[PDB]
Ligand binder design. Structure first.
Ligand SMILES: *Cc1c(COP(=O)(O)O)cnc(C)c1O
Ligand SMILES: *Cc1c(COP(=O)(O)O)cnc(C)c1O
Lengths: 393, 392
């Protein structure tokens, strides 16, 4: 009986009633630590441009080469006629970078979770998910017949308790964000991986925010804890953030690759990526090798920034990564703080309930290697000012 | 135990004949290309308009790449929306003749995004039984009641609309062009039936976009239902438009719902300058060169006519998707091997994927195919069909 326009109207009203309705801003200059929003130069702490690569001329030149050479599109899925020399070149470079036996590029970090989780899990397997796991993962799991258990965030005690209570002639898969998207804390892999080996279980790390951030040259969270050649650790990560393009990889055992080619639904049914994207990611792996400095500078800036927000008496939720949250509780106050920051030429988006828990709305700030001190001090200056008016310092 | 699970699963897949070993292309996506170090005529791509390697799209991508960089550094709804995303969605809607348009990460995730944003516990979906896998995943993530109607059977569809109602939303869901047989959804009859029972029509036009309607405005536009607010279309930009991503096109308010509720719009980085450049390019190009769409159909007709001359069954295909019936799957895969031996590259498809006595080779004719190329493929189809004794 219900019409379109009508259903859409009902649903936007509900979202406005619950305080959750969002109005995305449009950026009017390239993705850089300083950019234009609403016709004003702002300091940009909303991006995931961790290494300053989103507009770096090296990556742009590599993309230009490959675009000219090969074209604007693979005309098909990898498994029919969409695999070209350049996809292999990238997967070869990725594995070598990662120090994994293999690597496979899929169409996003988002679909990577669906693809790998779907390929790996059957009716009978048991999954142990961290409760704060990214939405991308929840969707992946929901498309499998596996028994889904949740453990309290980063709680290795509760995790162990659950591993004793659930066993299988099949597969036990512990699943965690490597770096938690909105909280900015690191999965305790030092303790999780050992625990995993004690109970014949496999560890799956979604390292969207660890890739290009954590470990020697940003080889990632797994590589940082030194578990990268363990055949019972699987890692999937986006190439959209620090590597500043699009797509996600799945890295580990040579035989894993060959399973995903055969069983991963987004690899089977969705076009492979064009030359320009693959060019740019080849470029990015080349660049981080030439310039490991950038990763140091990312952390100097992170430390400086977190220290000052602490000095001013902001709670940073014991963040350990360049992700530097500031909690506002209800979403309306989060969006307001965002508006006031922007008035001071500082861009940091308020985040609300679909994306982050109810009663736990925040502003995520994301310090990058490309941020200069001048920029970081302007943001703090503004955070001081905006914090005074709301009387939270 | 990971090695173990991987090993057991590849074994099962090899046992069941399902294991695949993708062939690697060594030259650009064109109607003639190199696979395994041989020049072939390429009828396996979705490069419908010859855009995958067209210098116009490459030059537009180059412009936008130079101007803007290698990446949006975020999801659209935080810090990933730039001028160029707006430019594209504005050009898309105007091209489509819809009130609005929104670009998502794929046609694949577009289904999940829009189906998820639109459906609540209580709604009823009527799916065509041959609907693309992409859709099944979308629906499986909603709390909607899922009903299936016999392929393109408007009679069974009507019967189901009498048998199931809701104070909520009735959504009929169909591929616009069906990927395997290349038949067109009967929208001429479906949309009227939909208006008779206060239901909304959802068309996945991955293979209609850039193919069907004036300048490939698509299946919806072809049947003249493009300004109806109760017809929703999602389609890939990866095939005829020869890049990546999918759009959702329709009512102004649909866009604003998807920005808010579509899970792949909220949780996946927006697409980089070069991709958006190329797609802007493609919409510009098809306007300048409506010829290409004509040429796609001339070649489709030419090719289907000759396969008929030789006495091949083309399954009443209506689209540049040209099946060629080989009956049993074994013979379909064999014919696929032998075509490639003659420098002709096409996909054999059999039982799990298509019914048991209806295995075929899918060919995809494009505007970029010349007659020389089409006659080489026919030459080969003649030869391989004689030796296998399925044609005079
Ligand atoms: C090709 C196709 C898809 C997937 O489009 P991608 O851009 O490859 O994700 C989805 N649905 C249908 C009907 C298709 O033909
Ligand atoms: C950003 C992110 C994703 C999605 O990455 P895309 O490739 O942009 O879809 C998935 N998981 C986590 C933890 C993320 O941070």
């Amino acid at each position: 009986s219900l019409d379109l326009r009508a259903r859409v109207r009902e649903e936007l009203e509900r979202l406005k009633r619950e305080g959750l309705y969002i109005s995305p801003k449009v950026l009017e200059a390239p993705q850089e630590p300083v950019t234009r929003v609403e016709g004003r130069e702002v300091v940009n702490l909303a991006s995931n441009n961790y290494l300053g690569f989103a507009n770096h001329p090296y990556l742009k030149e590599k993309a230009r080469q490959y675009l000219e050479k090969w074209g604007a599109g693979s005309g098909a899925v990898r498994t029919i006629a969409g695999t070209f020399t350049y996809h292999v070149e990238l997967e070869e470079a990725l594995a070598r970078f990662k120090g994994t036996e293999s690597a496979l590029v899929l169409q996003s970090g988002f679909t990577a979770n669906q693809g790998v989780l779907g390929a790996l899990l059957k009716e009978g397997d048991v999954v142990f998910s961290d409760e704060l796991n990214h939405a991308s993962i929840i969707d992946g799991l929901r498309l499998t017949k596996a028994t889904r258990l949740v453990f309290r965030h980063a709680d290795v005690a509760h995790l162990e308790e659950l591993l004793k209570a659930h066993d299988t002639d099949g597969l036990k898969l512990i699943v965690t964000d490597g770096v938690f998207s909105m909280d900015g804390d690191i999965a305790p892999l030092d303790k999780i991986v050992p625990l995993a080996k004690k109970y014949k279980a496999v560890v799956y790390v979604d390292d969207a925010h660890g890739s290009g951030v954590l470990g020697e040259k940003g080889k990632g969270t797994v590589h940082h804890f030194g578990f990268h050649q363990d055949p019972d650790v699987v890692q999937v990560a986006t190439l959209s953030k620090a590597w500043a393009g699009i797509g996600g990889y799945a890295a580990g055992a040579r035989e894993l690759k060959d399973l995903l080619i055969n069983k991963a639904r987004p690899f089977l049914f969705s076009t492979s990526h064009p030359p320009a994207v693959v060019g740019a990611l080849l470029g990015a792996l080349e660049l981080i090798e030439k310039e490991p400095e950038r990763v140091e500078r990312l952390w100097e800036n992170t430390r400086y920034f977190k220290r000052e927000l602490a000095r001013l008496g902001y709670d940073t939720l014991g963040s350990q990564t360049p992700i530097t949250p500031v909690l506002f509780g209800e979403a309306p106050l989060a969006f307001e703080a965002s508006r006031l920051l922007l008035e001071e030429g500082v861009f940091a988006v308020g985040i609300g309930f679909p994306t982050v828990p109810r009663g736990k709305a925040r502003i995520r700030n994301i310090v990058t290697a490309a941020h200069t001190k001048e920029m970081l001090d302007k943001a703090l200056e503004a955070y001081e000012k905006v914090g005074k008016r709301l009387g939270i310092i």
